[PDB]
Amino acid sequence: MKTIFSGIQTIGNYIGALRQFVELQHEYNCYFCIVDQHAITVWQDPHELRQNIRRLAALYLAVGIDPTQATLFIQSEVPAHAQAAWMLQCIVYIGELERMTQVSAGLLTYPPLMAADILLYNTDIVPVGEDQKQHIELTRDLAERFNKRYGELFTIPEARIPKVGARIMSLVDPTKKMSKSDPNPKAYITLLDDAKTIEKKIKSSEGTIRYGISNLLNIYSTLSGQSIEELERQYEGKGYGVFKADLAQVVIETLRPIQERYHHWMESEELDRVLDEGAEKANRVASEMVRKMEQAMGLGR
Amino acid sequence: MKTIFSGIQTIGNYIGALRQFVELQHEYNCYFCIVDQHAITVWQDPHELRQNIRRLAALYLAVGIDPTQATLFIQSEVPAHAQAAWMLQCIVYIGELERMTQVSAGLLTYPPLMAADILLYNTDIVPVGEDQKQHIELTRDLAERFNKRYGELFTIPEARIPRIMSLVDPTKKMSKSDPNPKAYITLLDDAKTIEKKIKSSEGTIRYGISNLLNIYSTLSGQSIEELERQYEGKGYGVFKADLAQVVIETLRPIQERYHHWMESEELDRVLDEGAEKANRVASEMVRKMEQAMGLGR
Numbered sequence A: 001m002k003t004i005f006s007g008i009q010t011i012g013n014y015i016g017a018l019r020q021f022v023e024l025q026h027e028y029n030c031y032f033c034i035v036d037q038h039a040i041t042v043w044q045d046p047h048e049l050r051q052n053i054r055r056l057a058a059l060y061l062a063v064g065i066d067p068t069q070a071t072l073f074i075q076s077e078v079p080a081h082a083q084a085a086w087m088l089q090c091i092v093y094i095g096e097l098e099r100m101t102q103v104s105a106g107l108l109t110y111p112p113l114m115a116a117d118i119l120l121y122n123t124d125i126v127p128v129g130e131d132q133k134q135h136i137e138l139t140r141d142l143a144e145r146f147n148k149r150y151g152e153l154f155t156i157p158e159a160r161i162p163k164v165g166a167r168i169m170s171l172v173d174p175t176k177k178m179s180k181s182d183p184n185p186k187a188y189i190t191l192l193d194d195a196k197t198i199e200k201k202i203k204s205s206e207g208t209i210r211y212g213i214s215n216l217l218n219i220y221s222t223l224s225g226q227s228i229e230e231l232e233r234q235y236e237g238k239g240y241g242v243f244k245a246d247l248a249q250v251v252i253e254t255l256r257p258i259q260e261r262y263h264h265w266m267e268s269e270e271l272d273r274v275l276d277e278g279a280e281k282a283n284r285v286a287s288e289m290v291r292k293m294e295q296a297m298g299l300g301r
Numbered sequence B: 001m002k003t004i005f006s007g008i009q010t011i012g013n014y015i016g017a018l019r020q021f022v023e024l025q026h027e028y029n030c031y032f033c034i035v036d037q038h039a040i041t042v043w044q045d046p047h048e049l050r051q052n053i054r055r056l057a058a059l060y061l062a063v064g065i066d067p068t069q070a071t072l073f074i075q076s077e078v079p080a081h082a083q084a085a086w087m088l089q090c091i092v093y094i095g096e097l098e099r100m101t102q103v104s105a106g107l108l109t110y111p112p113l114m115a116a117d118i119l120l121y122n123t124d125i126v127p128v129g130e131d132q133k134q135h136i137e138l139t140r141d142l143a144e145r146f147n148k149r150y151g152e153l154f155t156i157p158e159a160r161i162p163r164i165m166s167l168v169d170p171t172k173k174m175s176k177s178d179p180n181p182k183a184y185i186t187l188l189d190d191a192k193t194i195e196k197k198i199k200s201s202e203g204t205i206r207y208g209i210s211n212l213l214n215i216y217s218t219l220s221g222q223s224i225e226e227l228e229r230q231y232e233g234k235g236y237g238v239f240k241a242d243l244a245q246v247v248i249e250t251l252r253p254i255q256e257r258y259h260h261w262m263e264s265e266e267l268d269r270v271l272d273e274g275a276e277k278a279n280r281v282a283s284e285m286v287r288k289m290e291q292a293m294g295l296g297r
């Protein structure tokens, strides 16, 4: 089976990145890494960090990520990551690092950690956007550079969101992508948003439902299963008011089961057990790579 | 006891640092790390590397380093090293790094790794020279910045070592890295090489001749005042012949033990026990670090 690696630091994420994973995970060997070591490249409150790792894990599970199916782990719990990362920072060039479009040295040297994340698992696909295209080009060069010197250890990874989905825009600025990092909470809808916020958020000159309206349609159709033409027919003479009233219900219906599970997980001692399994599985596959890598460089014995 | 940490990548060395430790290990908690991870910041042949790691260990044991006493281990075998290094590579500044007095990024980022090497063990002293003084001030700075943000978790380390020149250039310092193999005497140099190297205008033994006295004076236990006396009214030929014998006598039992360690499988066992011990101390420091930063659970 092919290998997929996703490193994770809104309904736009569910719909673009996170949704097709609940089933893709059945046809692929999937890894969902919570990159907490990448997160400290910037200022964190230890309490929020620790607590943000938890919710994320519980959310991926609440969404349908199956731990029997996929490997969901926390990056720092697999030391092979920081190990392979060091070896790769020894083969990478500063020039390469500074040329990175995107001060603590972590802001500069994190690219080799992201490459280690990927290369450790002999991954084939990396479900990332164009914003990470440069990071992938680089981990692909690093793999090639190492495979040529020491002989082939790595699969050269490819940048793909297999079965990718509609791009979700902001509710305040439909020319802007939906981002949880938005200063206006009204711009996005969070997977944990309560029925009432969703409604209010959805509620806030031409008047025709035909493909901001184009964003509400993309949201409506992916979430309801209907085609944009179905809905264009459905609302042929209808106003934005009832369309929105309808759309707010399909969003609440989607997030309800999700939110109900997120809470069971957050309360379950099974959450900690699922992450323990995932790091064991990962440490195993990763630990093996690290020693094949050292074997090749002449490290230790 | 106070903790001493030494990271290792001639007789100049032995006289300088390594020899005293044989006594010190009993009074201090000493760690002798073979920095194989630092070694890869520059081009290595995988075979020679793997090989040099082995002999360095055998040489240290052969010199008198007591494993029941100190901790001799290979850096790569303690993962906590690269983990702490990353955490410290996020608090260090690039500017800090770039002013580093000393291309592959390993050549710019290894300082945070060298500070972790030290900080992981709550080391009090680091027995290094002046060339590392910029390196130590930086690790004292990183520890400081960390404690003040998170709380008191590292002992601020001191750089103190509780000078032999080249034999071909007495204004230059002895260094294996000399293009000229006669500039130095290796610990493994045979008796013939030792003699030759030592044989190679005032003609008076008073303090390149001041260097020989210093080599002699300390491998012998005698003193310079007492050696000047001894060698009143003789010249360099005898002085040089007696001195080649104190050097052969010194290195001979070291070479015997070294060879025994090199084919003994107690070697791999001393190293296993060594990494095990390090992993224990370091691992705990690491989870204490992630605790302060909020990493994992």
Ligand SMILES: Nc1ncnc2c1ncn2[C@@H]1O[C@H](COP(=O)(O)O)[C@@H](O)[C@H]1O
Binding pocket: A010, A012, A013, A014, A015, A016, A017, A018, A127, A128, A129, A166, A167, A168, A169, A177, A178, A179
């Ligand atoms: N508003 C959005 N619309 C579509 N895809 C998104 C949106 N927000 C995040 N993603 C995707 O979800 C994943 C999370 O990465 P990030 O871009 O940081 O959000 C990536 O693959 C993004 O491409």
Ligand SMILES: Nc1ncnc2c1ncn2[C@@H]1O[C@H](COP(=O)(O)O)[C@@H](O)[C@H]1O
Binding pocket: B010, B012, B013, B015, B016, B017, B018, B127, B128, B129, B163, B164, B165, B173, B174, B175
């Ligand atoms: N030729 C030498 N003369 C005196 N001390 C030396 C000599 N070589 C090494 N040392 C000491 O032993 C160590 C090895 O030097 P280095 O490992 O390059 O920093 C240092 O701590 C020096 O202070």
Ligand SMILES: N[C@@H](Cc1c[nH]c2ccccc12)C(=O)O
Binding pocket: A005, A006, A007, A008, A009, A035, A038, A113, A114, A117, A118, A126, A128
């Ligand atoms: N760097 C990515 C997250 C990430 C870390 N490691 C990865 C490995 C593969 C894909 C993505 C990642 C981001 O900014 O969100």
Ligand SMILES: N[C@@H](Cc1c[nH]c2ccccc12)C(=O)O
Binding pocket: B005, B006, B007, B008, B009, B035, B038, B113, B114, B115, B117, B118, B126, B128
């Ligand atoms: N960087 C040192 C060796 C070293 C690595 N880590 C260390 C920690 C403490 C003291 C020295 C070291 C050298 O150039 O030789």
